[PDB]
Amino acid sequence: TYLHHIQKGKLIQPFGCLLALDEKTFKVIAYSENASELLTVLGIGTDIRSLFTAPSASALQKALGFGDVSLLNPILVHCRTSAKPFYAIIHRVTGSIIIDFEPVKPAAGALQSYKLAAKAITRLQSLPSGSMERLCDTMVQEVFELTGYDRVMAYKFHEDDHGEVVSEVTKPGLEPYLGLHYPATDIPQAARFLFMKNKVRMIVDCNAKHARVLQDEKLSFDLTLCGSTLRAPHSCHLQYMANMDSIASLVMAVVVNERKRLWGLVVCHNTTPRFVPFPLRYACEFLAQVFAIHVNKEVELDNQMVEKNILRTQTLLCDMLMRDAPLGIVSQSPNIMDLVKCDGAALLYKDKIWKLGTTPSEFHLQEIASWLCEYHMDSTGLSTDSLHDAGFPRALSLGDSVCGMAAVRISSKDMIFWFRSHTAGEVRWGGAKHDPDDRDDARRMHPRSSFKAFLEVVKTRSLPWKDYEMDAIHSLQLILRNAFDKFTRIEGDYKAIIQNPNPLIPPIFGTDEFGWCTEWNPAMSKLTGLKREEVIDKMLLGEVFGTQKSCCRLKNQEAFVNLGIVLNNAVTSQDPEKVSFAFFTRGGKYVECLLCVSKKLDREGVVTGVFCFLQLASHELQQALHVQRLAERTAVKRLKALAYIKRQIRNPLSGIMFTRKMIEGTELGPEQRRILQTSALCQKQLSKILDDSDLESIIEGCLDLEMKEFTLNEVLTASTSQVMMKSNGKSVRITNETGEEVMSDTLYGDSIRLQQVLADFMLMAVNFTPSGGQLTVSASLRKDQLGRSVHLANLEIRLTHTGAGIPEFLLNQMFGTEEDVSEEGLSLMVSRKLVKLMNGDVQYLRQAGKSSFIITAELAAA
Amino acid sequence: TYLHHIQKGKLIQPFGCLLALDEKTFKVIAYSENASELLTVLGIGTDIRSLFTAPSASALQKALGFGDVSLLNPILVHCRTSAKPFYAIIHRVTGSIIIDFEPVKPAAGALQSYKLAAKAITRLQSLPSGSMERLCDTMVQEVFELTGYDRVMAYKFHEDDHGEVVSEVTKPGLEPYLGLHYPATDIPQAARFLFMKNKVRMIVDCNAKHARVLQDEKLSFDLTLCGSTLRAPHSCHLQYMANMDSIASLVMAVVVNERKRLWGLVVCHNTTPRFVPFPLRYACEFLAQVFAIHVNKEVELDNQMVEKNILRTQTLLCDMLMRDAPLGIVSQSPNIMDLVKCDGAALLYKDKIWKLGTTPSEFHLQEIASWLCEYHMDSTGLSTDSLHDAGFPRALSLGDSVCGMAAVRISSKDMIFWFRSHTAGEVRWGGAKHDPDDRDDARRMHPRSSFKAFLEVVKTRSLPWKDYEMDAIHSLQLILRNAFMDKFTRIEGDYKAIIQNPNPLIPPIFGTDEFGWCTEWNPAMSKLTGLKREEVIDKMLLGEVFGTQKSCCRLKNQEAFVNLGIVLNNAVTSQDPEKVSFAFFTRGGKYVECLLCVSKKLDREGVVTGVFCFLQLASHELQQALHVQRLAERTAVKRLKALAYIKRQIRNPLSGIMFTRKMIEGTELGPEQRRILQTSALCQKQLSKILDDSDLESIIEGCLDLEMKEFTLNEVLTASTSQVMMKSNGKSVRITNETGEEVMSDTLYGDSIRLQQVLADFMLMAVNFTPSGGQLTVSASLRKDQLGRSVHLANLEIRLTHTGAGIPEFLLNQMFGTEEDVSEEGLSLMVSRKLVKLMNGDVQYLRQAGKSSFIITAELAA
Ligand SMILES: *[C@H](C)[C@H]1/C(=C/c2[nH]c(/C=C3N=C(/C=C4\NC(=O)C(C=C)=C4C)C(C)=C\3CCC(=O)O)c(CCC(=O)O)c2C)NC(=O)[C@@H]1C
Ligand SMILES: *[C@H](C)[C@H]1/C(=C/c2[nH]c(/C=C3N=C(/C=C4\NC(=O)C(C=C)=C4C)C(C)=C\3CCC(=O)O)c(CCC(=O)O)c2C)NC(=O)[C@@H]1C
């Protein structure tokens, strides 16, 4: 096996010395070949104190007999002959305690080494939780500057033990490996087992004259070098790295629960032999642990969202109970589409179909019913990843517009559909497509010699239907049957995997106008142990949910008062009110749930009682809303100011609109009419900025552009108009030099947003240009040198000024370098991002003592 | 006694009839004289089914069998003779059941009764917590409009059982009772015991001639009337109410926990006889229960505020440990004055005195030091509310500047003092001072006839010294004495020499060196951890003292180990204290959840030499208070930065519009061109003024400063018209100014932008709700002859006009503040309401037949 070969390896990488001391007599029994030429007699049986100085021996011996030596590493020792600084790393092996010596090429202890990554941890913790891509990208970015390798990657393991690169930052000029998939056999289980114990592997150069550990034959024990930091990599990996042209590597390890699972590895490559000091490697261990800490939060947050999707679906399902059976679930605002994520829905009732979105034709839906009625008659529901895989003869007749389906037969020949469109199943492989039946074998020596990308075309399929999604469809099926259980799941392989669902209806209990209980759901009975008959007429507040001598017991008197308040506030507002409910069951179980209480309305429209139900949220979920509940009104109390300001700023903006519009009627000067056109564009800048409520609403998401005709002559004129008043006041000379043929180009990009981006960028030069200084604006389409045959475009704007350049603090705050942003540099961060959405990036460069804003943009048009 | 007299009372108020039925045979065992004339034959042995209609009798019979009959009260019944409505109040007594009937003079059950207080409940929960005065003030307001009594009071019970009025709202033209104290003799302990059972007690007529309840059953059981709502008030209290001139009363008992203590009472008075229907009385019971819960919450917040002060004192004390010298404890702003709430503090150290704040003279302080040197040798501390009470021979010389003092014996001659100034101890009694030697006497027949306020002057003392404040300064004993068994003498209230043992508040402290080994382990830490300092010194704090496995103190998991390392390294970089959570397992198994404060330790040479970690032990409720504070702060800094970007990026296009207007001027413009330009001018200043005064923190709750600028009336109408002309011209409504040519040409001086801003949104609110037809007319008037123009003032009247039904009042009343719903149309009017109101004017809607009109009158000068 591979593990047996790795643990029996007797070769070490020629960048250090490995001396092993006996556990009992505390003298060397094994040594590396290069020890004599690097530590200076090196013969076996000489105490280490002979080969070092007095402070080194005392420091080593004190930690030699320590309990756990992991934290004391690294240890700075000096040789007796020349006192050349060495780093000593000590790990204990049952055969002999092994010390690895690493020269200190021109931080002692675990805590001091962790300080090297302190700047990286403060960047990971100060991150918006929720997005795993941002967490992965910021971790690879930190390692890139922390270790200084040519290419840093985040290799994430999937369920099939194969991996995919989720993020990558490299030096410019290197081919990107982002998105590539690699076989599971590339990293065997021997390496996966050791990565949970070593957690850091470093290779200085894949072509090195390996040294030999010449342990004496008199040693009864089988000394192991698996845990050492100097272990020579296997010959297959040396050729594997040579094929990828990665001479040096530093592979990290991420373990979710330090149950425990190797989430992935952080791979740092280098085309040249690279050496990294041990404190940095130890620091990377801490950073990986912090990364694994935050990874476990993202999976928890994902688990919270899937719980909120169930809760939101439960809220929707209760609403569909009150609505009319055949047509109520369609006419209202929350449709059947909101129940299950879909691109369309249909409802075949009374030989009539109620299309609700991107659904097949009316004729085609009838043929869907014919296929369902015979091929899958036994099952009342069906879910298919792809309709062609199911066996539909005319799957291709309706095209690739829709390929998934989740249909349940409520009654007779009436069925309700749920259509899902296809997804881009394009996956790129690293040179070998992983397959389930491949297994690691020790006979293989040379790996694949080609690493070119493989484009594996996956058959046309939609997203797989989630397990919780299927119960939501089944829950509506129960609702519709009453208002008037085997499910087929053709997913993946062509196998009719029959399943039964779990009803997702919430525990529902109702009250009449006076207070007597009226309804008691079976889900309510199973949660509390009280049958429907025993709580069918007793008062809810007093006898059913009461403090003393009650069928269900509340915690204290506050619960009694709180329950009565909610049951009375329901009549005032029909909208559901969410409150925390807790009570004891007949068996003494303490349950914590979230109570939704809403009015019950009859056909006449009068209050006929209260319809309420509980949401069985988890303890972690309950605290999430409860904490947010303390600041829930902040979205209303504070929104008054934003709504008032936006409303109060809109009134005189309209006054500006009416005033200048009427000017066009009157007689105007020949060149004077041009002010109206410039003023109109600036006016539209106010209109669009008012629509954008917050910058925080665009940084995490994407601020959509505008597809409109647009000429470059006006925007530069409009952008200059904003900054002339500042420039004319504090003297600043401004000139524009742009292509005359570009005025008639009439580009298809956004005009108001690009004007805004250039407005503050041009303001930047004015605020830092000395009196009388210049300010040049340029433009260059360069349509003949970017491949305009394939529909694309290019753009560039230059902003040069005098004044020895702008200060560093304002300049550094762009590109998300410094976390804190000033009241002045935040706009530049938004402005820089606003051209990132335009496939461009702004840069700075100082030439001849001048400045330059190299802002680039691309016009994605067709 | 008083309780014995009440328990054997056979009189009831002539406001209803009382019928007592036996438990088994259900026959009338007792009745009142008024029953025959109110329920019609009637007598003992009469079945109650023969007094009402069949549907009503069965409803009563159903309630008689209910286990908890307080739920079904009240019950609406009708007499069979004439179907006269009645309310049945039922309560169970061991001897027999008692039924109270109440006439109905033009909600059945407890739930529907609570609906009458639903409006009052929502203005108690939606209250910003922190002060009991606001909660007490609003609760009195709820009962005032609900019950409609002449006056409503909040009577708080103090420790000595005497009461104090803490809140009061009355009908206009009364004598306020706020702040008045009343002796505990007024409310006997017998009445307090009954209030824990009968929450609400009502007296209708003070001079009513009670009708005796006849009971000639010759049975063993004695019929008690304590629980009946019809019970006759005691003879003494009947004369007690006559002196107060309060015929009717409605007292509500407030019990904090239902440990169970009567917090106080809510008293309602009415000069005329008053009747409150039972549902409102039951609703008042629910309101008291909600008030009781909120009172406990206010107490809990007050208790947490004390804990925060202890944590603040603990954090301050840790700084004094690192502070250099007894000279230094004065220099830095975290001085002794912040340690204890005091008006002054003086430190005596080696024949030199340092004073901070309001302290006595140099010479008097020396005698103060000499006074303890000859009076209180045994005690090392002192605490006197008043120095005159303590025994200073020259106490009067110090004056009112300093009256109280806390003293500390740092050394034989070293002393450090604190001073508190005299506080105005004004308490007004109701007419009889309450003395502790007063006991309830059952033989008393007439109460006091004088209720005028009697003012008792309390002796000149200071604020009462708290237990933790004397503890805080004792914690300074150990810190100062160590860096250089005991008794503390307290003089409080009556002259006494109480000796108490203080328990020092020094928090647990542990520190490490630059490598990781522990350097300190406080005795407080040893008690909490169970580990002696000997077993922790010279051992790694991370991994050997605090660690997951094989460690002295066991962390919960790898989460704590990583987090502890982060805070121990961020402290070196960040000198400021870091507030993080910390949990660890004591060797005894205790899971100590606490907060960790880490600050780097600086040597005298200025080089870092480790960390200084101390713990703030906080309850499970205090920790979440800071946790939600950060999350409340989590969206706080974001909106400031988000608004500062929207505000900054709207200013730039405004400068562009300003520049275009400044350049549209040209060489010269036509007669109308500059006029239409002028309308654009004042419209732009409205854009700038709104941005400068954004977020409306002042115009909504304060007196925003206005601008007095030479103004002309004619421009304000035209500029404000164009803002609303866009929507008006486009739709069916029209705008036509009323003839004011003489007065518009006439000049009045005011704030153009502020008046136009108010006028602009008032017209837009009009055009919006004009029902797609009719004309809008705006008029004006200048008043300088009708009002005195010799006062250098003038009156301006602006009158709008509608053509339609009229804006709804439930939205119009929102601008006056009566209504608060989610509709921005009323929000804008309310904010502008104070803006004109700031101009010594008012705004008034004036309804009419065809032409609904506004009225915007403001005070304008010249
Ligand atoms: C030999 C025929 C087979 C083999 C054996 C093998 N592989 C490892 C360890 C690693 N393999 C890795 C693969 C990658 N390297 C990359 O750069 C990328 C993607 C960009 C991948 C997927 C990685 C990483 C490791 C860990 C490196 C390390 O330091 O251990 C080993 C263990 C080496 C050792 O002696 O310790 C072995 C025996 N790998 C093959 O690809 C073929 C099938
Ligand atoms: C009789 C010699 C003594 C006495 C007896 C007494 N008092 C009560 C009940 C109350 N007395 C109250 C006093 C106040 N009333 C007020 O309006 C104010 C302040 C504004 C005060 C301090 C109050 C209140 C009550 C409770 C009234 C209720 O709800 O019942 C009683 C019990 C009456 C009964 O028959 O139940 C008795 C026996 N009070 C005196 O002042 C004299 C000394």
Curated annotation (Swiss-Prot), chain A:
Effect in UniProt of substituting residue 236 to A: Unable to bind the chromophore and cannot be converted to Pfr, fails to accumulate in the nucleus and to interact with FHY1
Family to which the UniProt record says this protein belongs: Belongs to the phytochrome family.
S-S bridge residues: none
Histidine kinase domain: residues covered: 644-861
Complex and partners: Homodimer. Interacts with NDPK2 and PKS4. Stabilized by interactions with PAPP5 and FYPP3 which are enhanced in the phosphorylated Pfr form. Interacts with COP1/SPA1 complex. Binds, via its photosensory domain, to PTAC12/HMR when photoactivated; this interaction stimulates its localization to photobodies. Interacts with FHY1, FHL and FHY3, especially upon far-red (FR) light illumination; when underphosphorylated. Forms PHYA/FHY1/HFR1 complex. Binds to PIF3/PAP3.
The keyword Amino-acid biosynthesis is assigned to this record: no
UniProt organism field: Arabidopsis thaliana (Mouse-ear cress)
Name of the protein in its database record: Phytochrome A
Record keyword Transferase present: yes
Stretches assigned to the GAF domain: 131-299
Pfam families listed in its UniProt record: GAF, HATPase_c, HisKA, PAS, PAS_2, PHY
Record's miscellaneous remark: PHYA association with FHY1 and FHY3 protect underphosphorylated PHYA from being recognized by the COP1/SPA complex.
Effect noted on mutating residue 155 to H: Constitutively active in the Pfr form, leading to a constitutively photomorphogenic (cop) phenotype and reduced accumulation in the nucleus
InterPro entries: GAF, GAF-like_dom_sf, HATPase_C_sf, His_kinase_dom, HisK_dim/P_dom, PAS, PAS-like_dom_sf, PAS_2
Source species, domain of life: Eukaryota
Function field: Regulatory photoreceptor which exists in two forms that are reversibly interconvertible by light: the Pr form that absorbs maximally in the red region of the spectrum and the Pfr form that absorbs maximally in the far-red region. Photoconversion of Pr to Pfr induces an array of morphogenetic responses, whereas reconversion of Pfr to Pr cancels the induction of those responses. Pfr controls the expression of a number of nuclear genes including those encoding the small subunit of ribulose-bisphosphate carboxylase, chlorophyll A/B binding protein, protochlorophyllide reductase, rRNA, etc.
Swiss-Prot/TrEMBL induction comment: Induced by cold.
GO cellular component, one term: nuclear speck
One GO MF term attached to the UniProt entry: identical protein binding
